[PDB]
Amino acid sequence: PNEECLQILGNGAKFLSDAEIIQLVNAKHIPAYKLETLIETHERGVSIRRQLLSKKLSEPSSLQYLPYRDYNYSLVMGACCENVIGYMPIPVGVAGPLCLDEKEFQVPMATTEGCLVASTNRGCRAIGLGGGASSRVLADGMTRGPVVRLPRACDSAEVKAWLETSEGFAVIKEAFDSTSRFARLQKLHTSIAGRNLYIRFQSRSGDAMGMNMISKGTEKALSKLHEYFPEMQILAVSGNYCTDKKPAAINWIEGRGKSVVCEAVIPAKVVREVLKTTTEAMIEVNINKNLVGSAMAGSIGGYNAHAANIVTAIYIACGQDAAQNVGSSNCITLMEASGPTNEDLYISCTMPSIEIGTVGGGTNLLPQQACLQMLGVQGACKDNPGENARQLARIVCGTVMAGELSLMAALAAG
Amino acid sequence: PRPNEECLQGAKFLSDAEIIQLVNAKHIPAYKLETLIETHERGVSIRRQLLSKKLSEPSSLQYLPYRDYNYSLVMGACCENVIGYMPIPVGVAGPLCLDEKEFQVPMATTEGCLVASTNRGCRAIGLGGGASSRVLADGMTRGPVVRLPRACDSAEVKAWLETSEGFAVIKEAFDSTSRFARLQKLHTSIAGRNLYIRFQSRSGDAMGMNMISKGTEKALSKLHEYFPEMQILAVSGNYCTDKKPAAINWIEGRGKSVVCEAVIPAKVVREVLKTTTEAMIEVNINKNLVGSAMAGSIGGYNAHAANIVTAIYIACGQDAAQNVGSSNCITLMEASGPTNEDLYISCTMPSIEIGTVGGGTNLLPQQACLQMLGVQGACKDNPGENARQLARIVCGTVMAGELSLMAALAAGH
Amino acid sequence: EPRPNEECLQILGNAEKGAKFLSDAEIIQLVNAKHIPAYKLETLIETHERGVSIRRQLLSKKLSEPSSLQYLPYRDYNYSLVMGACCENVIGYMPIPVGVAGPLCLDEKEFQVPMATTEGCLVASTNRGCRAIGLGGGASSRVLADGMTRGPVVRLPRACDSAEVKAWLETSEGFAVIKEAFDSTSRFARLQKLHTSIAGRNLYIRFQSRSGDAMGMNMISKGTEKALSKLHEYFPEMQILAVSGNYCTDKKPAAINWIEGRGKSVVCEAVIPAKVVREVLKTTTEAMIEVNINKNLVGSAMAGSIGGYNAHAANIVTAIYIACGQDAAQNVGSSNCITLMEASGPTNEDLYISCTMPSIEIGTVGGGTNLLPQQACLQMLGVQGACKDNPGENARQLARIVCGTVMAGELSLMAALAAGH
Amino acid sequence: EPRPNEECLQILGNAEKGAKFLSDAEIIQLVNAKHIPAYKLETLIETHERGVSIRRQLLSKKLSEPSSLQYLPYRDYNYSLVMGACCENVIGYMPIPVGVAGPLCLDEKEFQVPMATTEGCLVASTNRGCRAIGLGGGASSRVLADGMTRGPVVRLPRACDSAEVKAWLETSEGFAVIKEAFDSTSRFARLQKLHTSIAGRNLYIRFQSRSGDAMGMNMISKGTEKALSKLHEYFPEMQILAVSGNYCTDKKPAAINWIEGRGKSVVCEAVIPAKVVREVLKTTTEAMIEVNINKNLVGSAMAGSIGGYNAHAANIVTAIYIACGQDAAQNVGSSNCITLMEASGPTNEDLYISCTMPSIEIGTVGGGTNLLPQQACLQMLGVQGACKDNPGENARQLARIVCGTVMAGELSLMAALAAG
Numbered sequence A: 001p002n003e004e005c006l007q008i009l010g011n012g013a014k015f016l017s018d019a020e021i022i023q024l025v026n027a028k029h030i031p032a033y034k035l036e037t038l039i040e041t042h043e044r045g046v047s048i049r050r051q052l053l054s055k056k057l058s059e060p061s062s063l064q065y066l067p068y069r070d071y072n073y074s075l076v077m078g079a080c081c082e083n084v085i086g087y088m089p090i091p092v093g094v095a096g097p098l099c100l101d102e103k104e105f106q107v108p109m110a111t112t113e114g115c116l117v118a119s120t121n122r123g124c125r126a127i128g129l130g131g132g133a134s135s136r137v138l139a140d141g142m143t144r145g146p147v148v149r150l151p152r153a154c155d156s157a158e159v160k161a162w163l164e165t166s167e168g169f170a171v172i173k174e175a176f177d178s179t180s181r182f183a184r185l186q187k188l189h190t191s192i193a194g195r196n197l198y199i200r201f202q203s204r205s206g207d208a209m210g211m212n213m214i215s216k217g218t219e220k221a222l223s224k225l226h227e228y229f230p231e232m233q234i235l236a237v238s239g240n241y242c243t244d245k246k247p248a249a250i251n252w253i254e255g256r257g258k259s260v261v262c263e264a265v266i267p268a269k270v271v272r273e274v275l276k277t278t279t280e281a282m283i284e285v286n287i288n289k290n291l292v293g294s295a296m297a298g299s300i301g302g303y304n305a306h307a308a309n310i311v312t313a314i315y316i317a318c319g320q321d322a323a324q325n326v327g328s329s330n331c332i333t334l335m336e337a338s339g340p341t342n343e344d345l346y347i348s349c350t351m352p353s354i355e356i357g358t359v360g361g362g363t364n365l366l367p368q369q370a371c372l373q374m375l376g377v378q379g380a381c382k383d384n385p386g387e388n389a390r391q392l393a394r395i396v397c398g399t400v401m402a403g404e405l406s407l408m409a410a411l412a413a414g
Numbered sequence B: 001p002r003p004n005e006e007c008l009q010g011a012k013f014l015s016d017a018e019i020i021q022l023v024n025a026k027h028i029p030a031y032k033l034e035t036l037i038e039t040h041e042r043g044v045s046i047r048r049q050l051l052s053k054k055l056s057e058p059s060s061l062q063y064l065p066y067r068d069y070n071y072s073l074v075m076g077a078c079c080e081n082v083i084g085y086m087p088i089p090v091g092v093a094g095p096l097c098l099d100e101k102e103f104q105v106p107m108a109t110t111e112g113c114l115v116a117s118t119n120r121g122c123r124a125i126g127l128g129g130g131a132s133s134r135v136l137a138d139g140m141t142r143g144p145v146v147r148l149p150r151a152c153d154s155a156e157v158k159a160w161l162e163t164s165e166g167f168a169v170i171k172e173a174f175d176s177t178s179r180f181a182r183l184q185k186l187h188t189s190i191a192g193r194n195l196y197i198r199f200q201s202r203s204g205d206a207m208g209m210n211m212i213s214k215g216t217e218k219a220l221s222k223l224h225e226y227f228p229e230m231q232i233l234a235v236s237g238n239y240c241t242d243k244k245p246a247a248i249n250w251i252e253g254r255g256k257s258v259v260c261e262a263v264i265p266a267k268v269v270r271e272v273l274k275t276t277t278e279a280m281i282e283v284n285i286n287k288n289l290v291g292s293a294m295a296g297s298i299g300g301y302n303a304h305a306a307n308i309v310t311a312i313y314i315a316c317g318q319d320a321a322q323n324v325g326s327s328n329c330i331t332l333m334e335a336s337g338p339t340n341e342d343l344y345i346s347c348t349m350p351s352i353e354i355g356t357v358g359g360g361t362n363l364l365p366q367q368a369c370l371q372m373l374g375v376q377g378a379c380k381d382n383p384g385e386n387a388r389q390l391a392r393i394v395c396g397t398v399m400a401g402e403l404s405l406m407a408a409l410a411a412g413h
Numbered sequence C: 001e002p003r004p005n006e007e008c009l010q011i012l013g014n015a016e017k018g019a020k021f022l023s024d025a026e027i028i029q030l031v032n033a034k035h036i037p038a039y040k041l042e043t044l045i046e047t048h049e050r051g052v053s054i055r056r057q058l059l060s061k062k063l064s065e066p067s068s069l070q071y072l073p074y075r076d077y078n079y080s081l082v083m084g085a086c087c088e089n090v091i092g093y094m095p096i097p098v099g100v101a102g103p104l105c106l107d108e109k110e111f112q113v114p115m116a117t118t119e120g121c122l123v124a125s126t127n128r129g130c131r132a133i134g135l136g137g138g139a140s141s142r143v144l145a146d147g148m149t150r151g152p153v154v155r156l157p158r159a160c161d162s163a164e165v166k167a168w169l170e171t172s173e174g175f176a177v178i179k180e181a182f183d184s185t186s187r188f189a190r191l192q193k194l195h196t197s198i199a200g201r202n203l204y205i206r207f208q209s210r211s212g213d214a215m216g217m218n219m220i221s222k223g224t225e226k227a228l229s230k231l232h233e234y235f236p237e238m239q240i241l242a243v244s245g246n247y248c249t250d251k252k253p254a255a256i257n258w259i260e261g262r263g264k265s266v267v268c269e270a271v272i273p274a275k276v277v278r279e280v281l282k283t284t285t286e287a288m289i290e291v292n293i294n295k296n297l298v299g300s301a302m303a304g305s306i307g308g309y310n311a312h313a314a315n316i317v318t319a320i321y322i323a324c325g326q327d328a329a330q331n332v333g334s335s336n337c338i339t340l341m342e343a344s345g346p347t348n349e350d351l352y353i354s355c356t357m358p359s360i361e362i363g364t365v366g367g368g369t370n371l372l373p374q375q376a377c378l379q380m381l382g383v384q385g386a387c388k389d390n391p392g393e394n395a396r397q398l399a400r401i402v403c404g405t406v407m408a409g410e411l412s413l414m415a416a417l418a419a420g421h
Numbered sequence D: 001e002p003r004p005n006e007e008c009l010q011i012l013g014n015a016e017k018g019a020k021f022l023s024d025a026e027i028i029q030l031v032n033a034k035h036i037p038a039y040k041l042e043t044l045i046e047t048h049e050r051g052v053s054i055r056r057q058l059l060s061k062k063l064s065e066p067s068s069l070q071y072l073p074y075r076d077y078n079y080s081l082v083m084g085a086c087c088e089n090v091i092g093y094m095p096i097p098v099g100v101a102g103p104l105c106l107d108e109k110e111f112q113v114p115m116a117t118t119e120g121c122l123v124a125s126t127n128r129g130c131r132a133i134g135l136g137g138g139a140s141s142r143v144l145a146d147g148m149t150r151g152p153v154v155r156l157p158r159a160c161d162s163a164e165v166k167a168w169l170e171t172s173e174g175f176a177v178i179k180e181a182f183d184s185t186s187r188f189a190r191l192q193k194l195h196t197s198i199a200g201r202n203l204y205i206r207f208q209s210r211s212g213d214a215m216g217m218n219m220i221s222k223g224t225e226k227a228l229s230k231l232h233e234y235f236p237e238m239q240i241l242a243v244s245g246n247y248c249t250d251k252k253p254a255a256i257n258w259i260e261g262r263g264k265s266v267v268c269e270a271v272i273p274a275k276v277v278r279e280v281l282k283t284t285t286e287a288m289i290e291v292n293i294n295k296n297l298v299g300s301a302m303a304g305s306i307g308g309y310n311a312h313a314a315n316i317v318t319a320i321y322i323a324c325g326q327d328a329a330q331n332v333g334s335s336n337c338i339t340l341m342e343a344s345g346p347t348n349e350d351l352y353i354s355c356t357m358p359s360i361e362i363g364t365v366g367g368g369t370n371l372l373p374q375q376a377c378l379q380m381l382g383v384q385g386a387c388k389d390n391p392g393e394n395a396r397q398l399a400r401i402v403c404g405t406v407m408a409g410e411l412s413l414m415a416a417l418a419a420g
């Protein structure tokens, strides 16, 4: 019906059928934007959106194998996704044990690339027979890099000098830190371009990746800066000086999120039996591929074989922002001869800009929390704020090193 | 639970608890179960149980799902050591009015506001007459490193590859490996006695990594016949460049190079995007050009192309790790129209690495999202037209995302 | 005794008298009253040198310290070849000390390399590198490419239109038409394959061509102008925004020069015996490779370098460029260099070295190479002027000498760093 | 007249006779017979000019064309300040034409800028830019930072050890000990915030400090030796692999100089009235902005440039550097510049321009600035030598003049490109 359908809606939506609510869209009665709140259950809302979508597609049977039933939409709606028509299953394999810092980890990897999980698993095996890997977090601080503008370059210079004094920095730090308990503003990084001023705010953010919290603190910091400099115009809360989800030398040099190093010595016996190559062959490929090769290609921060493969796979499994693989994959892989007879392989990976978290975003979803719980880093750390996210970053750097070892060995053997 | 003595006699008759009790007691090794178990879902079940005992929290796997998923197309193709699947929420933004067509773009993400933002950008484009796009180039690459005894020798190989006859014989060996293998002009760079050779070729509708790799191996084998002292050091010497940031991809292109554009009426910028044309151009210059410049960016002259690229890629069975290079984008904005109050926008993406056959596009859920766009599988009549169409949709959806986010930043919300 | 401005104007306005009759103070009177422009002083006055003397006196009164130009030399210099070609508003010349480093044993020949510098120990260091190369049986080098570029930016109404122009330039027929127009501007113009890049409705076109022994800036620009005019006949809606849209790229750092090359791309190499590494360079092969990997590769990588995978190629390039009449501002791109080092020989104790420099922008005709003093330095190397029998051979040879001298400088500085001196 | 070998040697040994008593042809005979090596021809000869003449004669016979040095000048140059300080194996000097562009109206002062070049139209073009700036009310500039750097590479046995050293350097007390050692080497030394980067067991340490009016290369390297020696005491397993590990970065392109700055970071600006853009520059403000955006921003972006967002800053930097006794090889990094242009004023017809140069490496004492001809060009600008009442003011002033002259050159060349 048409008129009777509106009456029952005013009382609920359960008494109206699927075909009746879809008829309210077609025959203009009530618009399409009112759909999330109106329907009772979340799963039925997804079903009605899929039927509406089906008639717009040139092949309505497209959605047949896109699944949607029995998924927990309660944590997704109004938090992680909009216009939800279902979910996308990504196969999850396991590579391990990764022997890292006197512990053993089973690393979940969501991917559809054949041989990737198997390769990473072989890398872990080589590391494990070689006495294990060790890693350190060198720095920690998510950033946001707004652009502001003053009437003149002489004015923007005045603002830069003011922020660089002990007093000016104290005023902006107090504003920034007041927005949340984990907001602790580190030293600012500023760059002038004429009358423009790019300001890089950096702060730890507990176990969150921290972009929402740092953005809150930045908005408050710029409002405080407005009081001391009324002619200043906030052009954008991000002027790409952060830098988020684009390649940027500033992330490579200053770091962003977690800066991490990892290392291991692979005994000569393990290089031959597990990796099917030699230490000499591995060093030759590493120098001429990951250093010289990347140099000839004009790379900034891409001094590695396939760090992005491991970063992406762990990120999708563990509820991270996979778009941040742009900067998070930044990595330099070094190799040299080691031990008394110089036949053992010393490997290290350095990743200055791993953008990561174990609370918020996709880490609030239960399947993603399962993969985080495998690693023992799910949620916030009560006793040591930021320790779970720090640990996950160490696991990412260590797993990348396992991937580097294995693929470089395949390339070396020919 | 029976003893392990009468368990030695195949798999279907035994129980799950029996197989795991033979792995720990060490009757059977740990690499026999992949082949012996018949039903693929039961293979994943046993793997999860063995995995559970290695974890400090064995119950961590409970909410990682695995039942009733189609593992037939995954095993021996897409993933190893499989313990389940990870559901990523899929939203839809559209219609995207692109080249006199309308697209409903699937986006797999867990970032709030992303799909709604892109949807708003699509609406502004549609009310402004739509967008137009063009594929400027097409060719996946692979960039091996070879070594000769001396720099004079590597120089000889470079000059030889640059003659018409030397290139012709290398092109012959390359193209023999596949129906779609058609080698384009080579790009070579010397570093002492090293020579980096950038093989480029179309690959039908595939992303083309496996095909170009096979062509490269046969091409280098032919080059070995003419230069027997040459050593193939690595089939990839990072000169491709695959899954790392590289200026060579930005300048020369990799996969599909694409451009897209649209004019948004001044009224549409005000009412839909809640800003002005003047404010949009101001932010684009000082964020996407000057800001990226101050940050030392190569190819990152955009707001958040990577967000859209990643969401479409995960939804459509692409290699998400290739978002590193595929997200390369320069967003440009200027005034347009008679009164100079309309907003011309353009996005240029020189290295979209993409495909509609092979890899994750073999799986049915991923094929469902590809089918929404009308690009699933190989185009029989025009090989590569589906992959090219998907690249255009990516670039157009990126432009929609740029429009919407830049408007949010420009109005200072 | 000085005279009125009007009386001096009637004498210089006359043909048979000239500035010879007038004094210094009287000519200064005419310039200050704007009857005679300052920049034309050479033309009006009887000699070039007196024109420079008058300009100096004009300038000295403007300065807070009138005796500032005392030790800036100017007398007895050949200003005839500078005027209307190399410099304007000339107030003298700047002496840069010139040292010699050699012999450099390169491609079975020997070179005495001139180096203009004020940096202590640079010439001596480079000289030590030459000595090490000479005792190791010399260096070999190859020119891998040759072609100066210009990278204009044009614009179409739409990106769909700029795309059409790109596709048209990539057809065999379209490239042929543009090639005919480019090559019609000079006998040395041979247009190579076009490299194009779109940015929306913008189109950046990279024209590349040999240029005889000239660096080729002017010749490539003239060919580019004619080529774009021909392109406009097929596409009347195209606007030539700028003849250089920074896509060349000239005198700015750019990955496109590193990857595609610009001017001459060159590679050079040598093997230094272990004995020579110990006795001349005061280090070992193992220590040299260790420093090269971690400084010139890893170190440059950590600093975010594109093209700067070397110790100090720019010191050598700059010193040779100033001495040999080159454009010293082009050291920005010409200094692009990757230095590689590894073990060699039967006991893995000898030191293989190589330098690869893809973008040496250089010439032996035109610009500063027209001046006699810098022609003297070119004549040392046997590369002065145009090679008639093999056009471009002299400029090619100079690029090889630059690359080989850089390698000598890399050897010597890296040895000093490896020893911890 | 040319005496036998042994008769010439006995006079040389006697220190109250020397090589003055002998002739030119006799000294050449002593070099070829291998009695006295060629490198030791500086000290033995009496006057510096004669020593250069003898080196030139020995060189001439080695060359395929013995008359090649004919037009390379050498006579009557003051070699006293050059020998053992600025150049070795000296065979003469190379005259670079010097032109003047000005007045440059900068910070309420007027400057006559010397420019050593052989590129036609460069000085005249720069001069036209200065004239446009002057008729527009002048330019204003600011020094935003000042600190020469050196970036050694050290190595610990493990990455965990290199991590420990990084953390130690980041504490207040660790940095204080290193700053005390660094600052002790010179009265102008003041070590700023230390900036480090790990690569496995490598640690790259970027030392930064002001250096008075010197470019500071020698000063910073000496302070860095002392700093690393002090760090050796707390970490004896550390190995100084190289005093420069290319992390400075000196004389190579590097994003670190672009982002962190090196030497003087400077900004300059001016507004050119619409009337002056039309008449002097022969173009419009609209055409200028359009060329600047699509050439200096979009164009440099398409070429994959880091720090090269300008038309020809390198031309001006190089011309001033050679004229003023600077290290011209440092033009690689000193040329780093971004040029921005906007519409300005009430009709939106005036042209606002700015140039930002984060890494001008420069000095007014030491190096080639010790030579008299180079000191004359520095004297033109009022920046010769060390400022006693404010150490670093002369070098800061020259940096501002460079940035201002670059902006003048940017204005003029961009106008010629815009006009077609």
Ligand SMILES: CC(C)n1c(CC[C@@H](O)C[C@@H](O)CC(=O)O)c(-c2ccc(F)cc2)c2c3ccccc3n(-c3ccccc3)c(=O)c21
Pocket: A113, A114, A115, A116, A119, A305, A306, A309, A407, A410, A411, B142, B213, B235, B236, B237, B238, B240, B241, B242, B243
């Ligand atoms: C990590 C894994 C997915 N993988 C990869 C990565 C491809 C991409 O994800 C990134 C890669 O392009 C990054 C790069 O190296 O530039 C290649 C690979 C690299 C460069 C090529 F040119 C072509 C293939 C290979 C590979 C190549 C030849 C022989 C064996 C190989 N095995 C393998 C198979 C079975 C047992 C043992 C080893 C791999 O697992 C493998």
Ligand SMILES: CC(C)n1c(CC[C@@H](O)C[C@@H](O)CC(=O)O)c(-c2ccc(F)cc2)c2c3ccccc3n(-c3ccccc3)c(=O)c21
Pocket: A144, A215, A237, A238, A239, A240, A242, A244, A245, B111, B112, B113, B114, B117, B303, B304, B307, B405, B408, B409, B412, B413
């Ligand atoms: C695309 C979307 C996920 N989004 C984003 C992207 C954040 C990231 O994924 C990439 C971004 O960091 C890339 C960059 O700009 O550097 C920001 C954003 C950008 C820069 C910031 F500093 C902080 C937030 C914002 C945003 C910011 C302020 C006000 C509204 C906003 N809305 C919004 C909400 C409701 C209705 C209308 C608009 C967004 O949808 C949105």
Ligand SMILES: CC(C)n1c(CC[C@@H](O)C[C@@H](O)CC(=O)O)c(-c2ccc(F)cc2)c2c3ccccc3n(-c3ccccc3)c(=O)c21
Pocket: C119, C120, C121, C122, C125, C128, C311, C312, C315, C412, C413, C416, C417, C420, C421, D150, D221, D243, D244, D245, D246, D248, D249, D250, D251
């Ligand atoms: C080239 C020459 C002008 N030089 C230089 C300056 C290089 C610079 O122009 C570029 C350099 O900064 C590039 C780089 O390495 O980053 C240094 C030098 C380098 C880095 C430092 F930190 C401090 C000083 C050195 C040097 C240093 C220690 C011991 C010996 C040295 N010798 C030397 C002395 C006698 C016989 C043999 C060689 C030099 O000739 C020399």
Ligand SMILES: CC(C)n1c(CC[C@@H](O)C[C@@H](O)CC(=O)O)c(-c2ccc(F)cc2)c2c3ccccc3n(-c3ccccc3)c(=O)c21
Pocket: C150, C221, C243, C244, C245, C246, C248, C249, C250, C251, D119, D120, D121, D122, D125, D311, D312, D315, D412, D413, D416, D417, D420
């Ligand atoms: C600075 C000066 C030495 N100059 C230059 C330098 C080229 C180089 O030093 C840097 C340049 O390549 C950097 C770049 O723009 O990419 C060009 C120039 C630019 C791009 C070209 F394609 C070809 C020539 C021009 C120029 C070009 C066309 C018309 C007038 C010109 N005038 C001029 C003449 C008389 C009165 C007013 C101005 C110049 O002074 C001038």
